[PDB]
């Protein structure tokens, strides 16, 4: 059935001849889809006539010839609209292949986008482009505060270092100054796997007294403060301040 139904009518009537009378009898000049209605005749003086209808003239003649032989026996933009809604570029389609016979070359149009690729095969390029675009269509329609948490993290980090010394600091009264705070801070820094670094400043203030800033690796890193008439009194004061700092961080 590679030949036209109009040519099928011509071949099945070439046994005697007969020029057929093809007239379009009727037309729906419709609002969105005008349709055509051809009417096929056969001789005008003795003793056949059929209807045919379709959207195009060629398909109308096809339906008319098919009816006479049996008696003898608008999308496309909508998928682009949806890819606009899903915020995509306009699709690009390319031609893949044909058949070496130029009267029966089934064109294949290759529609590739940034997401998927599909093929469209047809006897003409318009039906191939529809088939590729529709395959795109249902393929795309098948698949259309915290710093306080850091502070509490540091709190459970220092609670994880559960040495006796910190709860000893928490429980008893710490008015006593006779304890040597240097070994205390060394043991506490070893307890939470941290380290203490003293920076006694060679620069002096306006009272002539000595001072120091002492650094411990917190999360994020921190320092404490101290001063005294001597540098030894300065590091003792900063040591005591850091010890009571660790005591009150563990105090909860």
């Amino acid at each position: 059935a590679m030949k036209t139904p109009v040519s099928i009518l011509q071949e099945l009537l070439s046994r005697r001849g007969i020029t057929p009378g093809y007239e379009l009898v009727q037309i729906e000049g419709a609002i969105h889809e005008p349709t055509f209605r051809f009417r096929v005749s056969f001789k005008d003086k003795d003793t056949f006539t059929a209807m045919g209808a379709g959207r195009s003239k060629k398909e109308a003649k096809h339906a008319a010839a098919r009816a006479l032989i049996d008696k003898l026996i608008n999308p496309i933009g909508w998928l682009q609209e949806m890819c606009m809604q899903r915020r995509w570029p306009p699709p690009s389609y390319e031609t893949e292949t044909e058949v070496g016979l130029p009267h029966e070359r089934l064109f294949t149009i290759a529609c590739s986008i940034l997401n998927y690729r599909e093929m469209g095969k047809g006897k003409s390029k318009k039906i191939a482009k529809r088939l590729a675009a529709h395959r795109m269509w249902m393929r795309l329609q098948e698949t259309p505060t915290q710093h306080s948490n850091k502070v509490s993290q540091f709190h459970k980090t220092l609670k994880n270092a559960t040495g006796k010394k910190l709860l000893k600091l928490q429980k008893t009264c710490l008015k006593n100054n006779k304890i040597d705070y240097i070994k205390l801070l060394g043991e506490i820094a070893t307890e939470n796997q941290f380290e203490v670094t003293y920076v006694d400043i060679e620069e002096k203030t306006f009272s002539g007294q000595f001072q120091c800033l002492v650094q411990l690796s917190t999360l994020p890193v921190g320092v404490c403060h101290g001063s005294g008439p001597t540098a030894a009194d300065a590091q003792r004061h900063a040591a005591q301040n850091a010890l009571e700092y660790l005591k009150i961080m563990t105090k909860k």
Binding site: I18, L24, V25, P90, G222
Partner: protein, 1635 residues
């Protein structure tokens, strides 16, 4: 705006007071100071331009820098004034004496130099704008100016000494000597302060909130705050003098104030912010010592937060705020609990107090469900720049804009702001206003307090212990602090701040003391409502007592209901300009008013009031008089409202109603079907055939008419398409032609041309000099012949189609005509006998004997038709004869391979043994099977020739015989038609179809020539039917220089306020006792909380019982009668103007001409070619269609409707004339007019396919099969009856109309035909002919002068219908010459019109057209808010006309181009050429900004930025801030065209001659290239990537951001005033960046 009128914008208020007298404008912002400065220079320059006087702007920022100051741009660009700002050591080049520069900006010592040299005279100067004088240095510099130039000149010679000093409240120094400094300043410069600005016009006119300066308590230091201050003061000592070896103080010092003022809980939540701001900013330390400082601060705040959390989270949220915070937040919580709609506006000092207050009220509003309605949003200030760190700046801008958009509409009420919320940001009117801080000065206090204007208004100021150092020392932790660690003066400051508060009330008393206008207090309006509300209300409809009235109070509420509902843009505040007045009558002070509704409004007179005893009863009564005259003049309807938009009813009789035909009317009313006037609904119309071609069959004996169908070949077909290479036969040389027999004389028709296999051939019809007397038996002869020609030859007969010789439709004869051998043409009777001799003769298959016998005849196959009789017997295909082939033979070489020679081929194919072997061959071809020869086969519609055949295929088909058609002669039968008669017979159907179409078009011409005298009746021949064929950096300067007057001003108005110049204690003591006694000072334990004749005599003291009578109230007409009697009996009523001289005089004292008109008398009307083209739809697939013609018809229709709507309805503003036009020009209306006037049955909508689109002559379709779905039965039954007799004898198979007799046509296409015929009548018979045709449809756009008939009128004045039952005609007169809009409500209106239009001669020398009625020019220039124009109206009525005039002018220019633009090209060389941007740029380029009068600030700033950015550009056409466009200047560009149109006695040569010189280089530039437009251009270049988001509102309150996005290409942004401007600039910047 009920009881107080609407206040003006404060800039024109200072402008009015400064025009009245000398002043010192005490206004803060520099830009509006520049606005008022520019304005008074302009108006008192208009006053100065009489004898020649200058007006200086002596200034202190001049004479040092070579650059020009900010007033140079203002007064050089946006005015017509020429300035000479003195350069640093100006040498005065050449003889350039200063009497020619209108403004003459100097320096003060320079002005002393000009005064002592007697070059600038101190008397011949009309204004002295000394710059800022709220500082010491400037006042000392200006001290020798006025200690030396007061005494010699009198105060008559002293000009206005306008001085743009700073804001009077935050200026100078001190508080006690403030009034003394102001009095000495006013006496120094010979002035009087008129400080009535936005600082004042928020507490005077608007709602006045009663403030409450509430005391909380002394914040007693509990042990928690004691330990917190102990550790913070421990850390203060180190960071005071910190150390470093080879920013932290501010966050360790200004956190303690949160502890002092708010408490420990807010200390935790405000060390939150500092902890984030330092932890984020400690990791970027380039040193190591500052890293340790920031670590110490951060871990101190960590310990602080931990201790505060352990305080009130482990030991135990309204109770926590109650117990563990300052009592100041308890006072705030009680204040917000006192409000059970609220728009609260809490303020602060810094930018971290706002955040902690936000978290305070968020947790209060959420944890405590009592105050559930508090939605909390905070907004801080901005300090950064786009120079560095754009990430933080953008994430702060996109948060601040969301916060202010949330507060903007209604979503979140409270807004805990900072100093950015005072100037700038536009916010809704508020309910509560809290100042958490005591105010810094009066600037913050009033710019914060002047925000709650609804009057349930409360403005609370929280007062507290003051600001001092709360530290102890440098010591370490105390014993109490360590115990807590191990275990766990209102009177002085409030006296000082109530002294500051009494000082603030004294400040506002001073400001109100310096005001010009004075207002009665609220006690007077209260006793007005109580006492005298017993007047007879003006009821328009008094019978139904729930309707309409104007009482005392409704009057003052209604005059500001009406004036605010007027046409006005964003820049204009339209208002009623009231005026108070006092006098003395009968010992009682009586008060007038005078009112002035806007000049935009049609109440163009002043409502001179009646003297009442108070001011506010006079106010209510003068508004009552205004509402009475308003309703009498027609502005008010039956419910005393202004008449709306759609409420305009046209008084002309042809207008209104517009009731439809019921087929159209029910589908308009129900609208379930597609609407009329649209292409979406189709309707099927009968294909009306010509009246000359129906019932014109000739009868035996009566003389009929013989029309030769003449053809003449013009352009033979070029041989590039001659692929078969056949000879070209002209049909002129053929002897056998064709004719038409018809009894009615065919009118003259245009000689159309067709395009056949021989090329272009021109078709005419001609009449014989003798007539045809038809004989008896020829009737059946031509009846047989016509059936033969149109049935067996051209195969045109369908089966629903049969020969009916006595028919109603398509009933003319066609005869075969022959040229006489001696010359001339006549009917071929012998050929008719030959044709009738053989009927439907099947071409017989002959035996061998005769072709054996006779030889070939060369003469028999000259012009032969040679069908093969050995196949296709019933309906053979007919072949031509192109050539004879003697060089071939039946034994010659076969083209193919499968057969031998032609004798062998015919022997073995059929059996036809060719007995004649010496016979030639016949080079033949088919005959035409597509009968439509109307289109050229080798041309496009655009003239582009189509590709002809390749030379290889041409020579293959012509030379190689595998192609081609070669046929033996003795095996073919000659048709009785020759080849020449066959080509004419094939070209007949298109000839008859075009003759029919021309006859319908001539029928329309005759119909309108009979209905209205538009054309000749019966007729020379027509014109033939055819088918037609460095800098960018400078731009940054012009984007920042304007903001220069912004930038410095902001800092200049928030910190300095400094520099003094060189009884009060009693007043402060009185105010302090009033504040402490009157409940304003809230103590810290007190929570926040007559008979008719007597009334008549006290109300009308200036007889009374005669006017009262026995009825109850008194009449307003009686009231004016008592006034008239009293002024008649008592001479004069000399009035004292209580606190306007601003306006006065009412309350005071032939290269394509476009209008070319042919003589319509004795005129043939349009040709039927152009009427056919107007009828020809674009679906015809013909070379003519209506589409290019509807674009000029539509533009002329819109033009003429607009001009008529201007002329008839002369008081109404054009916002309803637009509604009348939109009623009249809409395609529903033009549809129903067309279908009324039977046009749908006259059009072509289908491609002419003669086998399926044509009913041949003397044939008759039954018109029954198309609804139903023997031959003699079909004959006599289609004669008698249709349905009953027939019924006794791939979707919608019962489809509509057969194509032979009806066609489907959509509705908008008949509107298009109406407009196309307006275009055809326009082009042929002038604009007046199109006007009369527009009347003929039913849109009567002309006036009627019904005059008695001229006694068989004969001359026939065109545009005058056929007479009715009596002899009277309805002659349509021309358009009326309009009413000049010179409102003669002033006694010298021509002199005041010339006075207010001084200096426009530069404009008229620019344009070339000198106006004759210059009031048109002023009306075209006058903005809606140019309030001193008591002479004309605003321009909107003239813009409404000018844009339609320019629309038609552009369309008829682009229609006249030889380039022959499409509907699209001629549309888009208009759409991208009549635009607000191009109109504004041609306005700016030709100086329309320089001559546009307005009194609006925002429009002046927009005009500033645009004119500067254009004057940089040579006047050529992070969020991308592109320049806002002055739409007012585009409207001026249109309104000058409208004004020239009306001023020119309504012509279009003058408008186009003026506007060509402007728009012409855009005409050739945009005509050469392709213009487009930026939103459309970006949606065209990237067709469907581009999506536009919903617009967002910026934090500024008057900015819109659009955010264009191109997908996978970039996301872009632009900001602007409207949404159109912001969309345009964002798409424009994406257009420029995407390249």
């Amino acid at each position: 705006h009920t009881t107080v009128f609407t206040p003006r914008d404060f800039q024109v208020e200072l402008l009015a007071t400064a025009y009245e007298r000398n002043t010192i404008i005490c206004l803060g912002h520099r830009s509006s100071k520049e606005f008022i400065a520019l304005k008074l220079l302009q108006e008192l320059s208009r006053r100065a331009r009489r004898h020649g006087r200058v007006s200086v702007y002596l200034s202190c920022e001049v004479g040092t820098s070579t650059e020009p100051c900010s007033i140079y741009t203002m007064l050089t660009h946006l005015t017509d004034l020429r300035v000479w700002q003195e350069q640093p050591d100006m040498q005065i080049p050449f003889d350039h004496c200063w009497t020619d520069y209108h403004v003459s900006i100097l320096r003060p010592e320079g002005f002393l130099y000009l005064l002592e040299t007697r070059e600038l005279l101190l008397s011949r100067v009309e204004l002295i704008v000394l710059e800022d004088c709220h500082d010491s240095a400037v006042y000392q510099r200006i001290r020798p100016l006025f200690e030396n130039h007061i005494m010699p000149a009198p105060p008559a010679d002293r000009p206005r000494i306008l001085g743009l000093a700073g804001p009077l409240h935050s200026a100078g120094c001190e508080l006690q000597q403030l009034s003394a400094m102001l009095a000495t300043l006013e006496q120094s410069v010979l002035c009087q302060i008129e400080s009535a600005s936005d600082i004042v016009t928020v507490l005077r006119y608007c709602s006045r909130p009663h403030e409450y300066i509430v005391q909380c308590a002394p914040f007693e230091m509990d042990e928690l705050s004691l330990v917190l201050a102990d550790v913070l003061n421990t850390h203060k000592s180190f960071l005071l003098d910190h150390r470093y070896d080879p920013d932290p103080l501010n966050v360790i010092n200004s956190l303690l104030v949160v502890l002092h003022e708010m408490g420990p809980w807010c200390t935790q939540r405000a060390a939150h912010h500092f902890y984030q701001c330092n932890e984020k900013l400690k990791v970027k330390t380039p040193h190591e010592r500052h890293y340790l400082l920031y670590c110490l601060v951060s871990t101190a705040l960590i310990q602080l937060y931990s201790l505060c959390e352990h305080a009130f989270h482990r030991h135990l949220s309204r109770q926590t705020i109650e117990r563990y915070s300052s009592p100041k937040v308890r006072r705030l919580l009680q204040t917000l609990r006192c409000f059970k709609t609220l728009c609260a506006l809490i303020y602060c000092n810094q930018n971290h107090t706002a955040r902690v207050l936000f978290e305070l009220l968020a947790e209060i509003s959420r944890r405590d469900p009592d105050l559930k309605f508090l939605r909390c949003q905070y907004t801080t200030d901005r300090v950064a720049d786009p120079t560095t760190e754009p990430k933080e700046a953008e994430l702060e801008h996109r948060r601040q804009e969301e916060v202010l958009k949330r507060f903007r509409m209604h979503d979140c009420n409270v807004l805990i702001g900072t100093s950015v919320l005072e100037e700038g940001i536009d916010v809704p009117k508020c309910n509560l206003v809290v100042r958490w801080d005591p105010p810094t000065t009066y600037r913050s206090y009033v710019q914060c307090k002047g925000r709650a204007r609804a009057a349930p208004a409360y403005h609370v100021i929280l007062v507290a212990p003051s600001y001092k150092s709360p530290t102890v020392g440098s010591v370490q932790l105390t014993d109490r602090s360590h115990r807590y660690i191990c275990a766990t003066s209102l009177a002085s400051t409030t006296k000082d701040l109530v002294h500051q508060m009494a000082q603030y009330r004294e400040i506002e008393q001073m400001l109100l003391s310096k005001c010009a206008n004075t207002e009665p207090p609220e006690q007077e309006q209260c006793e007005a409502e109580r006492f005298s509300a017993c007047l007879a209300a003006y009821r328009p409809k008094p019978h139904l007592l729930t309707g309409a009235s104007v009482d005392l109070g409704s009057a003052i509420a209604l005059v500001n209901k009406y004036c605010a509902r007027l046409p006005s843009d964003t820049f204009t505040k339209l208002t009623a300009l009231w005026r108070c007045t006092r006098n003395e009558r009968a010992g009682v002070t009586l008060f007038q008013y005078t009112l002035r509704l806007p000049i935009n409004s049609p109440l163009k007179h002043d409502i001179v009031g009646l003297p009442m005893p108070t001011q506010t009863l006079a106010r209510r009564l003068a508004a009552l008089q205004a509402c009475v005259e308003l309703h009498r003049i027609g502005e008010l309807d039956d419910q005393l409202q202004p008449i709306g938009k759609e409420g305009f009813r046209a008084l002309e009789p042809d207008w209104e109603c517009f009731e439809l035909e019921p087929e159209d009317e029910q589908i308009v009313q129900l609208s379930d079907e597609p609407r009329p006037g649209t292409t979406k609904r189709r309707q099927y119309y009968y294909k009306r055939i010509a009246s000359e071609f129906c019932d014109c069959r000739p009868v035996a004996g009566a003389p009929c008419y013989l029309y030769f169908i003449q053809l003449t070949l013009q352009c033979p077909i070029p041989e590039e398409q001659n692929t078969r290479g056949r000879k070209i036969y002209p049909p002129e040389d053929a002897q056998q032609g064709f004719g038409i027999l018809t009894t009615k004389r065919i009118p003259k028709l245009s000689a159309f041309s067709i395009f056949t296999r021989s090329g272009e051939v021109k078709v005419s019809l001609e009449l014989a000099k003798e007539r045809v007397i038809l004989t008896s038996e020829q009737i059946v002869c031509i009846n047989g012949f016509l059936n033969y020609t149109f049935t067996n030859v051209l195969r045109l007969q369908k089966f629903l189609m049969l020969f009916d010789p006595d028919s109603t439709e398509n009933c003319v004869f066609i005869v075969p005509t022959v040229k006489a051998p001696a010359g001339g043409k006549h009917i071929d009777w012998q050929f008719l006998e030959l044709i009738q001799a053989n009927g439907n003769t099947m071409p017989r298959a002959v035996p061998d004997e005769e072709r054996q016998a006779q030889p070939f005849d060369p003469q028999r196959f000259q012009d032969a038709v040679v069908m093969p009789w050995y196949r296709n017997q019933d309906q053979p295909q007919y072949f031509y004869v192109a050539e004879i082939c003697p060089h071939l033979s039946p034994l010659s070489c076969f083209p193919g391979d499968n057969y031998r020679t032609f004798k062998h081929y015919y022997l073995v194919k059929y059996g036809l043994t060719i007995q004649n072997t010496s016979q030639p061959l016949l080079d033949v071809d088919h005959t035409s099977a597509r009968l439509n020869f109307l289109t050229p086969r080798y041309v496009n519609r655009k003239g582009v020739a189509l590709p002809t055949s390749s030379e290889e295929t041409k020579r293959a088909k012509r030379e190689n015989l595998e192609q081609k058609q070669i046929l033996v002669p003795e095996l073919c039968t000659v048709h009785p038609f020759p080849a020449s008669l066959w080509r004419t017979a094939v070209c007949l159907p298109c000839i008859l179809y075009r003759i029919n179409g021309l006859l319908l078009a001539d029928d329309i011409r005759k119909q309108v020539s009979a209905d209205l005298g538009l054309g000749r009746q019966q007729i020379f021949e027509w014109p033939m039917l055819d088918f037609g064929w460095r800098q960018k950096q400078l731009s940054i300067i012009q984007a920042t220089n304007a903001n220069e007057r912004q930038y410095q001003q902001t800092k200049n108005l928030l910190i300095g306020f400094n520099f003094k110049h060189e009884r009060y204690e009693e007043s402060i003591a009185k105010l302090k006792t009033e504040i402490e006694s009157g409940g304003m000072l809230v103590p810290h334990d007190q929570q926040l909380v007559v008979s008719m004749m007597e009334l008549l005599k006290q109300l009308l003291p200036y007889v009374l019982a005669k006017k009262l009578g026995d009825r109850r109230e008194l009449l307003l007409s009686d009231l004016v009668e008592l006034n008239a009697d009293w002024v008649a009996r008592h001479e004069q009523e000399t009035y004292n103007v209580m606190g306007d001289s601003f306006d006065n005089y009412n309350d005071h004292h032939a290269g394509f001409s476009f209008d070319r008109q042919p003589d319509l008398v004795g005129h043939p009307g349009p040709s039927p070619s152009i009427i056919l083209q107007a009828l020809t739809m674009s679906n015809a697939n013909d070379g003519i269609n209506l589409e290019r013609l509807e674009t000029i018809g539509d533009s002329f229709l819109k033009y003429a409707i607009t001009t008529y709507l201007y002329i008839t309805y002369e008081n109404v503003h054009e916002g309803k004339l637009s509604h009348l036009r939109s009623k009249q020009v809409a395609n529903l209306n033009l549809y129903r007019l067309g279908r009324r006037k039977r046009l749908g049955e006259y059009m072509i909508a289908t491609k002419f396919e003669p086998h399926d689109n044509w009913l041949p002559p003397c044939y008759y379709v039954p018109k029954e099969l198309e609804k139903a779905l023997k031959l003699a039965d079909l004959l006599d039954i289609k004669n008698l009856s249709s349905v009953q007799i027939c019924e006794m004898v791939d979707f919608s198979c019962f489809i509509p109309y057969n194509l032979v007799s009806q066609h489907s046509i959509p509705d908008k296409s008949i509107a298009d035909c109406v407009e196309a015929l307006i275009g055809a009548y326009l082009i042929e018979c002038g604009p007046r002919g199109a006007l009369l045709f527009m009347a003929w449809l039913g849109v009567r756009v002309l006036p009627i002068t019904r005059q008695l008939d001229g006694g068989n009128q004969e001359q026939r004045i065109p545009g005058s219908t056929k007479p009715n039952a009596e002899n009277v005609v309805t002659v349509y007169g021309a358009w009326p010459t309009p009413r000049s809009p010179l409102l003669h409500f002033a006694p010298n209106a021509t002199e005041e019109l010339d006075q207010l239009l001084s200096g426009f001669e530069e404009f008229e020398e620019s344009l070339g057209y000198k106006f004759r009625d210059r009031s048109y020019l002023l009306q075209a220039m006058t903005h809606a808010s140019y309030t001193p124009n008591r002479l004309t109206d605003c321009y909107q009525r003239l813009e409404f006309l000018g844009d339609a005039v320019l629309d038609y002018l552009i369309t008829r220019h682009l229609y006249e181009d030889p380039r022959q633009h499409s509907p699209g090209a001629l549309t888009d060389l208009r759409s991208a050429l009549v635009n607000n941007t191009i109109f504004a740029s041609l306005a700016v380029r030709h100086g329309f900004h320089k001559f546009f009068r307005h009194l609006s600030p925002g429009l002046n700033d927009v005009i500033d930025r645009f004119v500067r950015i254009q004057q940089e550009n040579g006047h050529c056409i992070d969020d991308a801030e592109d320049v806002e466009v002055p739409k007012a200047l585009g409207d001026v560009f249109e309104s000058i065209a409208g004004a020239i149109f009306l001023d020119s006695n309504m012509s279009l040569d003058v408008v186009w001659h003026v506007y060509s010189n402007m728009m012409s280089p855009e005409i050739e530039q945009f005509s050469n290239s392709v213009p487009k437009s930026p939103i459309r251009e970006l949606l065209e270049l990237e067709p469907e990537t581009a999506k536009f988001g919903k617009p967002e509102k910026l934090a500024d309150g008057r900015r819109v951001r659009v955010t264009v996005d191109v997908f996978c290409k970039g996301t872009f942004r632009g900001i602007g005033r409207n949404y159109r401007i912001a969309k345009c600039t964002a798409a424009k910047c994406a257009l420029r960046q995407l390249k």
